[PDB]
Amino acid sequence: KGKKKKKKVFTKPKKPIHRHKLEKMRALKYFKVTENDDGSFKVERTRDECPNPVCGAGVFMAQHKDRKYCGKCHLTYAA
RNA sequence: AGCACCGUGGCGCAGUGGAAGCGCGAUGGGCUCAUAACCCAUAGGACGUUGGAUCGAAACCAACCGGUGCUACCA
RNA sequence: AGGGGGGAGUACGUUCGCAAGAGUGAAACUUAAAGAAAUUGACGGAAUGGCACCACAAGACGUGGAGCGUGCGGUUUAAUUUGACUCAACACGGGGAACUUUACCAGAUCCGGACAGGGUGAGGAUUGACAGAUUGAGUGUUCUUUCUCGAUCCCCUGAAUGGUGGUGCAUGGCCGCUUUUGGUCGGUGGAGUGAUUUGUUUGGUUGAUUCCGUCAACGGACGAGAUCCAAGCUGCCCAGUAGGAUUCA
RNA sequence: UCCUUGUUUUGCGCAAGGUGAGAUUUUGGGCAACAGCAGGUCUGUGAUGCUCCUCAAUGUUCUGGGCGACACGCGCACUACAAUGUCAGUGAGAACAAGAAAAACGACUCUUGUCGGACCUACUUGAUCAAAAGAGUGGGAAAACCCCGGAAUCACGUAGACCCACUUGGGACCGAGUAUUGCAAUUAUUGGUCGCGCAACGAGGAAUGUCUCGUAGGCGCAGCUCAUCAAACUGUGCCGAUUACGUCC
């Protein structure tokens, strides 16, 4: 047994801690609304949902430069 | 400068012709609750050097060398 | 004749004695004990008696010489984690460890920081991650990127917690050893003014404070003994998981 | 108990013999007082006082790699194997032992609240050609299976080989090939056959260990630990003596 007290080789860049990367008003950036035609409001989306039972509700996919992705079932439809 | 004695294991020594030993040591064990005390096993020798005598020796003879004592005192 | 112990039977004076000495006989100063008897311990180059295959006799089998496995000491290493050292350390810590176990070394990760008093709008504070890069790591650790989610998770002090960290000379429990030897204690009675003693003693006997005899002791409690477990023999019990006998082919 | 009416004090008992399955603590264990040690253990525990450490931790880390009782001139402790011709050594044939060990782990298929398999071992095959391995089937929850438990020591009128030599006595070291265990066997993990034996060692100094009858010594098996590996420990069986049964040095 026995023991001592000291830990420091150190003196590098240590890791930052992961911290949430915020999007604000996330729903309104997905759902798009239009000029009003015929008194009826036309709702479109820039986000399309993944076809798996788990994602079958409302749960949308993603959009990167070179890939499309689903954060719910961790999937890739590649671009 | 002669005379005398001595030279053998790390150190001190034994050994009068059939020719490597002892006491202190060193090193490693054992006895003891430990230490002294005391046992045992290991390694360690051109027997000063050279010639001679001798069937044959380290032992006797000679030559030289070294050490110590005694007497010498060097135009 | 004596009036605490020393100083001292010394000093001075004097009488006696040939001499050696004898008689008489202080003080200054110093000290808190000196001394007497009895009892219980301890000790003895005093006396006497008992007991042990961890003691010896007799004599069987080894170790100590070699070659291995394992432990310990020491040396070396980044680390070779560590307890234990005469008998009661050293094939011991159920310790024959590939990882785990694991204390030790190099490196990275996670909150298992409860409890919210102090901060966080619908986005909140928040969780998880494909791909690329970092990296020992096709480890979202972290970043880029975007998506995905309890709002306790998150941010700051106080506090809590966990630890094979320290102290076994803080401590409990358990174990070892003293010690496998036969030992330990009180009541009432007896003896002494009592510290005490008898009982628990001289003797014989037994592994045994085990008994007997003598006897101012008597009667108890623990240890010993007994009660418990296994082995040898046997009764009753029992067989379609035990095993024999006879008959016939 | 009985007897010797021996011995002893009539006593406590003792010796020899008898009786008997067994003859004197019948045999071997477990338990075990009073007073203690500054023995060991904080590495047994949600057994703990006070302290140390706490988010870049001494916590957690079943994370990756190394180290551990493992690393190598040397001392010491315990173990195992030998130096062979008293089974002695390689080959063959015969007989023959007992304590003990195994069963459930949320997956599976069963219906409506539950079957089978993860543990042993037999037989058969593999085997129209080494071992080790492989595969299919069956039994046992243990006095049913394994199991008539074919242990080794041992025995042989087996006309077996061998012959006194470091030899065919002993193997230590050392190279190549292969299969199994496991997530991972590299510092060879364990088996299993070839080569290495020309490496030691020829009964062992001073000293020293514990033993009195089913004992000493020789020999083998199981349990323990546990994916794998026991020269260890715990337990059971076989073969089975010599000497003493006394003393205090």
UniProtKB/TrEMBL annotation:
GO terms for cellular component: ribonucleoprotein complex; ribosome. It comes from the Eukaryota. Keywords: Isopeptide bond, Ribonucleoprotein, Ribosomal protein, Zinc. GO terms for biological process: translation. GO terms for molecular function: structural constituent of ribosome. Signal peptide: none annotated. The keyword Ribosomal protein applies. In the N-terminal section; belongs to the ubiquitin family. This is Ubiquitin-ribosomal protein eL40 fusion protein.
